[PDB]
Ligand binder design. Sequence first.
Ligand SMILES: Nc1nc(NC2CC2)c2ncn([C@H]3C=C[C@@H](CO)C3)c2n1
Lengths: 275, 99, 10
Amino acid sequence: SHSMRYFYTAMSRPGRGEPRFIAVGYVDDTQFVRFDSDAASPRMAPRAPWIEQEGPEYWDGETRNMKASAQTYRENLRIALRYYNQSEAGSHIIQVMYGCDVGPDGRLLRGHDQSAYDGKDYIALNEDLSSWTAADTAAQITQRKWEAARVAEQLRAYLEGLCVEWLRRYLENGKETLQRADPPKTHVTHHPISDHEATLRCWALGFYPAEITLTWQRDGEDQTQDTELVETRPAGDRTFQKWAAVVVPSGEEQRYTCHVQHEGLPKPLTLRWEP
Amino acid sequence: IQRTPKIQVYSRHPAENGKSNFLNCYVSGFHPSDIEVDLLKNGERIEKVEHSDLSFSKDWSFYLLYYTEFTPTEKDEYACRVNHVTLSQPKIVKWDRDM
Amino acid sequence: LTTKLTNTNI
Ligand SMILES: Nc1nc(NC2CC2)c2ncn([C@H]3C=C[C@@H](CO)C3)c2n1
């Protein structure tokens, strides 16, 4: 089961020029394209090796789409000011995410299109792909305009069509990474805090995709409520890192076990501090 | 709405003194989008720092990864300095190779 | 591939 997601951000900045427009594209947890209007030669550009084989008509066409989208989103920022009776002196932000999820057979599971204005929910295409949920009176104005202009049907056509078709293409072209789970490299470190207590830290490094479970047990009792668990973070090389730590009484260290669950591991993994 | 950045500073690979690596500062969970992030070597700003493209999570909060090649040594200190509209003064998080 | 619906005003 897989996903393709585009994230567009438009940010006004009065006194500092026209609004900035940034778009990024992901397949699952892998970024594969970007566009930034503040780039020297602003264009859609590759961010994963398996999209680089796309020809110049792909890049020219995507760049065309992004420039037209930037223009429309800038218009939309101005419209939002009217809807909310806001001044042209404030900076504001539109965020939009859209895309498709497919199952293991490649059929469309779900389409997405939802947005925020200044970080608050604005309007979202419903799962039926034919109706909208509007969060406030401003978005209700948009809802009516979009019903009139048959926006949902055209979006539905994209989500059920090109979105799924191109996702399938990407998944095949990048199968050696996108459909190849990379298990974490794991180890446990030990750090005395005093003569009476120590930190045990369980590391999971270089894994893909991001979803993982990292837990400490004491005598086979779960310690999640006593565990410091950091947010999963990008390694910088398209893989991820995470760790979980517990402070333990000196002498109890061999009673603690770290448990790692990940798609790239055939079985639950169990680790201890190896002195 | 305003959300203050969460900050993690860490290396791409486990640190070995004298071995080349990447110093990362991951900033996430923030809104609005303007943010200033610097990587410091011994209190001083590092010049060559790159960053990922602005994206956001399902709750609309933004995230960015700032990074630079570095070689860790025993007594060289590294840190990440972050400024955001929600911060009264810049927040400095020291790099700890054990974290 | 991004959508070619690029004209939509709110
Ligand atoms: N939910 C939503 N809100 C949008 N605008 C808002 C929040 C002010 C918005 N603008 C465009 N779209 C779709 C049309 C084409 C796709 C790419 O642009 C998405 C949008 N969908």
